[PDB]
Curated annotation (Swiss-Prot):
This is Arylsulfatase. SUPFAM superfamilies: Alkaline phosphatase-like. The active site is at 49 (nucleophile), 113. Keywords: Calcium, Cytoplasm, Hydrolase, Metal-binding. It comes from Pseudomonas aeruginosa (strain ATCC 15692 / DSM 22644 / CIP 104116 / JCM 14847 / LMG 12228 / 1C / PRS 101 / PAO1). Its EC number is 3.1.6.1. GO terms for molecular function: arylsulfatase activity; metal ion binding; phosphoric diester hydrolase activity. Its cofactor is Ca(2+). GO terms for cellular component: cytoplasm.
Length: 526
């Protein structure tokens, strides 16, 4: 029989957060899947949420699929540019659209971030059943601030805007907490399914994305765990990554860069609030894991899990952003939060708190990689991923084989026996995948789905990367980089520390040719 699919996406989860990826956070359900499956150390997304999601569900690049930049970042200049529509566009066909016409039941519960309008919903784009947060974020409990002209832009852009199928919801249920509600709905849809046909189940959490919020009883489990701070944590993560074989023992970690005060420079009250944010974060991840368990355990008891291809991934690097640092997110975010929320120590994590853990906590989870979410360095794009499917040969191991989010759609089509329709679908021109099916690799026929000549690009927020084999060039503009192409050998320098631009000018030049072709193939506009 054709397999089921369960595609689970964490939101801004960091590389070493989960237990089997070197973390101290309780993730038993994921860990059971991970150790019996295949853990990926060289799996890549885009550097931010909607770009990644557009790639996941198409098998092509975000600049083609409609999210050339984030909608919330769109300009009048970028306006009519193809692929910069700000929603999944009609130049692509989505994975669920293809499966659904081939007899799969398409079921989703979670964050969408691929369009706000009726014709852009999961219902519109291939899901027979869906319960979805349409924006990029929202209050986990559905506590909404006043909305008027004076509301910070980052809050105006993140209302708790939910749909079920075609119905825009006017209320949320009592006791609504995002991760629990997604677990509840997806379980509902699975229990309500036609058991005589396969399913494609999509479970995009909004945890552990800001605002950091979680049940108090889970936050309590972490009381005091993070009192030694983000650098002490980074060292624990690095040690554990090397003990587990996820990173080689000789790997040189990128230095931590931030403009904030280091832990030892903070006052006791400042530390206590920052540590509490990280305790809350941990609980978000544990609670997400618990919901995943509810879904997976149900499938297991049904006798369906072993014929379910289970993919878990984060959508981008850990979130190091200081939301107060960007005037576009304002005006006066901190003041608004001071007047509308309660970020007192004892209230952090509750519905009427609103915190984010910042650059030092984030870089603890991306280490040894350079930087974090919204950068084209490895910190922003290399994400934890696991595949559990016992029909595959490559299970029980850790793989450092190059892989991307664009490989997923072709892999699942392949397993489903469903052909990509080529260049036309429903009477319109569509893009063909840029990724490659993982089947030969995971079936043990080949060592990897890519090779030394594979070329992949990235570009978002003025930053660039271009990679061929294990050679990668990066471009970070001022004030966050040198506004010049830097060149790295990822096989020797996973931390992107040693710029080889001057010593290997021919390799850089080759990569710059690839970058131009990437721009041209995908329609990148800066
Ligand atoms: Ca994200």
């Amino acid at each position: 029989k054709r397999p089921n699919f369960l595609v689970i996406v964490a939101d801004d989860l960091g590389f070493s957060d989960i237990g089997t990826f070197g973390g101290e956070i309780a993730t038993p359900n994921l860990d059971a899947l991970a150790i019996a499956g295949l853990r990926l150390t060289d799996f890549h997304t885009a550097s931010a949420a909607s770009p990644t999601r557009s790639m996941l569900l198409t098998g092509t690049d975000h600049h083609i699929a409609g999210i050339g930049t984030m909608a919330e970042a769109l300009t009048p200049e970028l306006e009519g540019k193809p692929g910069y529509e700000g929603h999944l566009n009609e130049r692509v066909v989505a994975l669920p659209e293809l499966l659904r016409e081939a007899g799969y039941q398409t079921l989703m519960a979670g964050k969408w971030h691929l369009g706000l309008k009726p014709e852009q919903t999961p219902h519109a784009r291939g899901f027979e059943r869906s319960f979805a947060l349409l924006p990029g974020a929202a209050n986990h409990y559905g506590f909404e601030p006043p909305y008027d002209e004076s509301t910070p832009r980052i809050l105006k852009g993140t209302p708790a805007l939910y749909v079920e199928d075609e119905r825009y919801l006017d209320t949320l249920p009592e006791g609504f907490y995002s991760s629990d509600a997604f677990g509840d709905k997806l379980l509902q849809y699975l229990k309500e399914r036609d058991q005589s046909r396969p399913f494609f189940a999509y479970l995009p959490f909004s945890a552990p994305h800001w605002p950091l919020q979680a049940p108090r009883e889970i936050v309590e489990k972490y009381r005091g765990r993070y009192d030694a701070g983000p650098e002490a944590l980074r060292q624990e993560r690095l040690a554990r990554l090397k003990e587990l074989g996820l990173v080689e023992a000789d790997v040189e970690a990128h230095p931590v860069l931030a403009l904030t005060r280091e832990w030892e420079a903070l006052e006791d009250e400042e530390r206590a609030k920052s540590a509490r944010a990280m305790e809350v974060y941990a609980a978000m991840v544990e609670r997400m894991d618990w919901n995943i368990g509810r879904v997976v355990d149900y499938l297991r008891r049904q006798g369906e899990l072993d014929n379910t291809f289970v993919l878990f991934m984060s959508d981008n690097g850990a979130e190091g952003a200081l939301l107060e640092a960007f005037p576009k997110f304002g005006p006066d975010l901190l003041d608004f939060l001071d007047r509308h929320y309660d970020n007192s120590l004892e209230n952090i994590g509750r519905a009427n708190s609103y915190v984010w853990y910042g650059p030092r906590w984030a870089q603890a989870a991306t280490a040894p990689s350079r930087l974090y979410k919204a950068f084209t360095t490895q910190g922003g794009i290399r994400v934890p991923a696991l595949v559990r499917y016992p029909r595959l040969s490559r299970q029980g191991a850790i793989s450092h084989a190059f892989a991307t989010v664009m490989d997923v759609t072709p892999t699942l089509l392949d397993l489903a026996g469903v052909r990509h329709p080529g260049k036309r679908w429903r009477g319109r021109e569509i893009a063909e995948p840029r990724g490659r099916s993982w089947l030969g690799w995971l079936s043990g026929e080949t060592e990897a789905a890519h090779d030394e000549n594979t070329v992949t690009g990235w570009g978002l927020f003025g930053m660039r990367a271009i990679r061929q084999g294990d050679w990668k060039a990066v471009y970070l503009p001022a004030p966050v980089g040198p506004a010049t192409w830097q060149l790295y050998d990822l096989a020797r320098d996973p931390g992107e520390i040693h710029d080889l631009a001057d010593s290997q000018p021919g390799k850089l030049a080759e990569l710059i040719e690839h970058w131009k072709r990437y721009v041209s193939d995908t329609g990148v506009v800066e």
